[PDB]
Amino acid sequence: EEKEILWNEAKAFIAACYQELGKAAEVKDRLADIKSEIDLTGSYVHTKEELEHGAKMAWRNSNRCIGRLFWNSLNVIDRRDVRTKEEVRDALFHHIETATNNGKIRPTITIFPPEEKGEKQVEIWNHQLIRYAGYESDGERIGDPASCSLTAACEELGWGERTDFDLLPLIFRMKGDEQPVWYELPRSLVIEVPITHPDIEAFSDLELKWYGVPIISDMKLEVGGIHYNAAPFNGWYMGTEIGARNLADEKRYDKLKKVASVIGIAADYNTDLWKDQALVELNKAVLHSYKKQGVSIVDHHTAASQFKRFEEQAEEAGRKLTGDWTWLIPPISPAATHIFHRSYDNSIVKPNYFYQDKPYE
Amino acid sequence: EEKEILWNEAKAFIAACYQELGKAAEVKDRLADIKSEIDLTGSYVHTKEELEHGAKMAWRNSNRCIGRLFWNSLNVIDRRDVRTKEEVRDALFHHIETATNNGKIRPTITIFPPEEKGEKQVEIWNHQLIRYAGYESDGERIGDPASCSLTAACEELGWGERTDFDLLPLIFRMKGDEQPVWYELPRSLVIEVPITHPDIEAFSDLELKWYGVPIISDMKLEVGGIHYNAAPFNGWYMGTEIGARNLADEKRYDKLKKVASVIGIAADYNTDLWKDQALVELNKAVLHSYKKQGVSIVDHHTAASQFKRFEEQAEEAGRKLTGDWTWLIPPISPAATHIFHRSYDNSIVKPNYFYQDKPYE
Ligand code: HEM
Ligand code: HEM
Ligand SMILES: Nc1ccc2ccc(COc3cccc(CNCCc4ccccn4)c3)cc2n1
Ligand SMILES: Nc1ccc2ccc(COc3cccc(CNCCc4ccccn4)c3)cc2n1
Ligand SMILES: [Cl-]
Ligand SMILES: [Cl-]
């Protein structure tokens, strides 16, 4: 019953993958071997080639991702050999270092052992490997509200300085342990960017910063029926993620009214469009700051131009394009991108990245 | 067969409408009379009360409309008595005048005789009663590209000065005529707003203007199975419709690069976010200009605040809310509105406004 869905997903996956790799004649012998292994063992093991291409396919199929032009240059690190907390921690440290690449960010995924039969071998608690803590004590709000529950979980395990930019530790659980372990990130590994504005010297009075590399670490990678629940991956930021959402949302750092004040405009009348102007200057400052520091970043116009090339590459390859319009349009000037003016089929195609339940409340 | 769908839509409509009007006990006798009329005549005639409430319900159900808070104050003008071109033309003139209301815009719909049995009694060719012509001759682009086909149709019928802001004439066809007639709009009836900026005196060098009142005139109003294909209606503008779309879209007036130049910023690098900054200043100028001239207009923040009140009024009345997220979010700073951060059921509920085929190519 379980075995059965696995074998089907493996047929679809191996056929499609070997076809794209030009290995179509190797398909029957490989599915023979796979059908054996599933009967014998209940599961099967991807080749390095299948695992690498499967992770790239999963990015290519990620309907909500505007950055998919570059799906085929994904740097796949195969860490299915890890067995200990120390090895997990070091592989996550290595990912940060090699993905950061001194600021010239490399899109990277590190793939840990897949779930055996429902049972996770490694369970990562971080939403991103690098993220700020958040606190909420008697109406005192500090740091990143989106991190409050994970921050509270971490402080149950004996771990913050209660700045607005505390780095959460790595926190993950190994199969067999009842509690996750945590490890403080070495600060030598974490690039952060202070936010300054190209024109407005006072912008630095806000003392904003953000980290260089978004490394999403709580999504499941599914390839041919194998469930890689621990497979953190990163791209580089699109500047609106930082300037229009992380620093701007009322339920995040909520900085627009402070932005308005340091750029010298009143924040009193809706019709002054002060939120919109503050958003533009904050997003300009973010792109400027990342560029000045030599940390990779893309603006939403260039990103959508790249995504149009991805759409054209799909059609030219004879692949259906799928996409989630509500996530593809940027939160800043969306009608200034081609995305806004077309529609997308939101069908789910596998391999893909998927949400999974949090282990903390 | 035809009669049959009509009777069903009438049952659903009359029950729901009389219930909201507190006339639930009058329902059986009215559907009796309706069942008679449909058998006798093939159709039935709304009371002024049903027609007024049905048009209000249709606005309330308009999934894409952020302005629905005010659905119950819609000013319904019953023009089912018109029979001649002159009466149609005068009713459309009257609509412009009374909806404009010297700039204090009144949401108004004028309802013409419904389609008999598929056959339109009046067929309005305008997309809006007030709109600018568009021209496209040997790569010379003038006026509003969205009006090119209707403008070309109008010039087949003997009607432009080829400014960028020529008013199209009213153009409509009466049952029985093979060709529509057209009538030049009296300029005394058309308020236009020159676009100036509150801070940047050079903005007036762009010589932009827009008209005061958007009067959508090509949608079908359906109420209880009766198809009012000619029922032009208006609200007031939300400023982004003008500043983020009509004047900004590359396939409309395409003014952002000229905006950038008069506000003194370079239009060279995506990462300067010059399109976003130009959009904000253009949208500020639009709101400022309408306000200075005393013409009603709403900014997208106030509008979304109003729409949140509509959502709360729906829940408090025990009505399901429907909505189209992709049209409800504004094209400027959408994540700064509550709409962006929630989802909406896009189910179609009647009475409603619907697209219908254009009569011109
Ligand atoms: C190379 C640079 C990249 C850029 C600029 C980029 C851009 C983005 C953006 C802006 C989002 C929307 C998130 C939001 O609205 O907050 C997104 C979603 C996503 N991206 Fe990419 N991305 C990139 C690389 C990657 C990589 C390397 C992968 C995986 C291998 C990936 C997989 C996804 C997935 C799964 C989502 C959806 C997540 C969800 O549903 O919550 N992206 N991307
Ligand atoms: C009172 C002021 C009003 C405001 C500010 C407002 C705002 C808007 C906006 C911004 C749109 C989206 C159009 C676009 O994205 O270009 C829209 C769509 C719509 N509005 Fe409203 N509206 C108002 C009044 C009305 C009235 C009076 C009716 C009818 C009685 C109406 C029916 C609709 C319909 C049917 C649509 C969708 C049209 C389509 O699908 O193309 N609205 N509204
Ligand atoms: N550069 C990059 C590169 C890769 C990325 C991979 C994943 C993500 C995930 O990102 C989010 C996850 C959860 C919530 C949010 C908040 N945004 C929501 C967007 C939205 C659109 C429409 C309606 C509601 N919400 C983001 C980011 C990546 N970023
Ligand atoms: N103040 C008001 C008041 C009432 C209005 C009634 C109707 C309309 C119709 O408006 C449009 C009709 C056709 C095209 C467009 C262009 N915008 C498209 C919006 C969009 C969203 C997402 C994806 C693609 N397109 C508008 C306007 C009214 N306006
Ligand atoms: Cl983020
Ligand atoms: Cl318009």
Residue-by-residue DSSP string for B43-94: S----HHHHHHHHHHHHHT-TT-TTGGGGGG-EEEE-TT--SHHHHHHHHHH
CB contact at 8 A, A216 and A234? yes
Q: Cα(B343)–Cα(B330) distance, rounded to whole angstroms? A: 15
Q: Cα(B135)–Cα(B233) distance, rounded to whole angstroms? A: 26
Q: Where are the domains of chain B?
A: 1-80+107-117+220-234+304-328, 81-106+121-191+355-359, 192-214+237-302
A151 touches chain B (CB under 8 A): no
Q: Cα(A239)–Cα(A288) distance, rounded to whole angstroms? A: 10
How far from B111 is each of B83, B97, B125, B222, B223, CA to CA, in Å? 13, 16, 15, 11, 11
Sign (positive/negative) of CA torsion B120, B122, B123, B127? negative
Tell me which DSSP letter residue B332 carries: S
How far away is chain A from the Cα of B150, in angstroms, using its nearest Cα?
22
By CA distance, what is B287's nearest residue in A?
A271
Environment class of residue B55 by beta-carbon count within 10 Å: exposed (0-12), middle (13-18) or buried (19+)?
Answer: buried
Please tell me the distance between residue B66's alpha carbon and the centre of ligand 2 in angstroms: 7
B60 annotated active-site:
no
Token pair listed for A298? 């893309």
A272 interaction partners in chain B (CB closer than 8 Å): 284
How far away is chain B from the Cα of A107, in angstroms, using its nearest Cα?
21
Residue to substitute from B280, B308, B341, interface A, most A β-carbons within 10 A? B280
- In chain A, breaks (C-N over 2.5 A) are found after 159
Which residue type occupies A289? S
Of the residues B59, B60, B65, B131, only one is catalytic, namely B65
A332 interaction partners in chain B (CB closer than 8 Å): 273, 276, 333
* Residues in the annotated binding site of B: 65
Q: Cα(A275)–Cα(A256) distance, rounded to whole angstroms? A: 6
By CA distance, what is B245's nearest residue in A?
A335
Sign (positive/negative) of CA torsion A55, A57, A60, A62? negative
Specify the residue for token string 């200075």: B292
Ligand with an atom nearest the CA of residue B131:
6
B283 interaction partners in chain A (CB closer than 8 Å): 273, 276
CB of B326 sitting under 6 A from ligand 4: yes
CB contact at 8 A, B194 and B208? yes
Size of interface A-B (CB pairs under 8 A): 92
Please tell me the distance between residue A62's alpha carbon and the centre of ligand 5 in angstroms: 17
User: Cβ B249–A335 below 8 Å, yes or no?
Assistant: yes
Residues of A noted as catalytic: 65, 68, 236, 241
- Report the residue among A150, A216, A247 best suited for mutation to probe ligand 3: largest number of ligand atoms under 8 A from its CB: A216
CB contact at 8 A, A124 and A150? no
How far away is chain A from the Cα of B118, in angstroms, using its nearest Cα?
32
How far from B57 is each of A23, B106, B246, CA to CA, in Å? 60, 17, 28
Backbone angles phi, psi at B231, to 5 degrees: -155, 70
CB of A233 sitting under 6 A from ligand 3: no
Q: Cα(A182)–Cα(B115) distance, rounded to whole angstroms? A: 71
Of the residues B60, B68, B79, B173, only one is catalytic, namely B68
User: Cβ B335–A249 below 8 Å, yes or no?
Assistant: yes
A220: left (phi over 0), alpha (psi -120 to 50) or beta: beta
B323 interaction partners in chain A (CB closer than 8 Å): none
Specify the residue for token string 């104050």: B73
Nearest CA to ligand 2 atom 30: B59
User: Cβ A284–B272 below 8 Å, yes or no?
Assistant: yes
Q: Which atom of ligand 4 is nearest to the CA of A343?
A: 23
User: Residues within 5 Å of ion ligand 5 by Cβ?
Assistant: A 214
How far from A283 is each of A167, A286, B105, B202, B284, CA to CA, in Å? 23, 5, 36, 26, 19
CB of B64 sitting under 6 A from ligand 2: yes
Entry resolution (Å): 1.8
User: Cβ A273–B325 below 8 Å, yes or no?
Assistant: no
Please tell me the distance between residue B214's alpha carbon and the centre of ligand 6 in angstroms: 6
Of the residues B71, B125, B236, B274, only one is catalytic, namely B236
Which residue type occupies A178? E
B183 touches chain A (CB under 8 A): no
Establish how many alpha carbons lie within 13 A of residue B184's alpha carbon, considering only the half-sphere containing its beta carbon: 9
A11: left (phi over 0), alpha (psi -120 to 50) or beta: alpha
End-to-end alpha-carbon separation of chain B, Å?
Answer: 31
User: Cβ A333–B249 below 8 Å, yes or no?
Assistant: no
- Report the residue among B329, B340, B343 best suited for mutation to probe ligand 3: largest number of ligand atoms under 8 A from its CB: B340
In sequence order, what are the residues at sequence separation of 6 or more whose Cβ sits closer than 8 angstroms to the Cβ of residue B177? none
What is the side-by-side order of every strand in the sheet holding B220-223?
A: B226-228, B220-223, B352-354
What was the experiment behind these coordinates? Answer: X-ray
Query: Residue B241: which of B306, B189, B287, B289 has the closest Cα?
Result: B287
| b/e burial code for range B224-252 (CB count within 10 A of at least 16 → b) | bbbbbbbbbbbbbbbbbbbbbebbbbeeb
Q: Cα(A129)–Cα(A169) distance, rounded to whole angstroms? A: 8
Q: How many CB atoms lie within 10 A of CB A193?
A: 23
How far from B143 is each of A160, A358, B137, B192, CA to CA, in Å? 61, 55, 12, 15
Token pair listed for B248? 């900004």
Percent composition of chain A: helix, strand, coil (DSSP 3-state, to 5): 45, 15, 40
Q: Cα(B259)–Cα(B267) distance, rounded to whole angstroms? A: 10
Please tell me the distance between residue B120's alpha carbon and the centre of ligand 6 in angstroms: 25
Which residue type occupies B239? G
Strands (E), chain A: 75-78, 108-111, 122-124, 134-137, 140-143, 170-174, 181-183, 192-194, 209-211, 215-216, 220-223, 226-228, 233-234, 352-354
User: Cβ A271–B334 below 8 Å, yes or no?
Assistant: no
By CA distance, what is B199's nearest residue in A?
A272
CB contact at 8 A, B133 and B144? yes
DSSP bridge partners of B135: B142
How far away is chain B from the Cα of A265, in angstroms, using its nearest Cα?
12
How far away is chain A from the Cα of B250, in angstroms, using its nearest Cα?
9
A167 touches chain B (CB under 8 A): no
Q: How many CB atoms lie within 10 A of CB B359?
A: 16
User: Is residue B293 classed as helix, strand or coil in its secondary structure?
Assistant: coil
DSSP string, B90-112: HHHHHHHHHHHGGGS---EEEEP
